Amino acid sequence: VRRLMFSYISDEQWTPFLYDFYHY
Amino acid sequence: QLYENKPRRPYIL
């Protein structure tokens, strides 16, 4: 199943792991 | 200027 993430963003570090959509 | 430039990891919306 996918991790649905938009309003409450429960994630650790900022780093761009894979080149999908959010990659800064 | 007024631009929301913050560092974001790959989180699937």
From Swiss-Prot, chain A:
It comes from the Eukaryota. The ligand binding pocket consists mainly of extracellular loops ECL2 and ECL3, as well as transmembrane regions TM6 and TM7. It comes from Homo sapiens (Human). Interacts (palmitoylated form) with GNA11. Residues 1-24 are annotated as: Neurotensin binding. It is found in: Cell membrane; Membrane raft. The chain holds residues 321 to 344 of 418 of the full protein. The gene is NTSR1. Coiled coil: none annotated. Belongs to the G-protein coupled receptor 1 family. Neurotensin receptor subfamily. NTSR1 sub-subfamily. This is Neurotensin receptor type 1. N-glycosylated. Residues 6-23 are extracellular. Expressed in prostate (at protein level). Detected in colon and peripheral blood mononuclear cells. Detected at very low levels in brain. G-protein coupled receptor for the tridecapeptide neurotensin (NTS). Signaling is effected via G proteins that activate a phosphatidylinositol-calcium second messenger system. Signaling leads to the activation of downstream MAP kinases and protects cells against apoptosis.
UniProtKB/Swiss-Prot annotation, chain B:
Neurotensin is cleaved and degraded by Angiotensin-converting enzyme (ACE) and neprilysin (MME). The record marks 10-12 as: Cleavage. The modification Pyrrolidone carboxylic acid is found at residue 1. This is Neurotensin. It comes from Homo sapiens (Human). The chain holds residues 151 to 163 of 170 of the full protein.
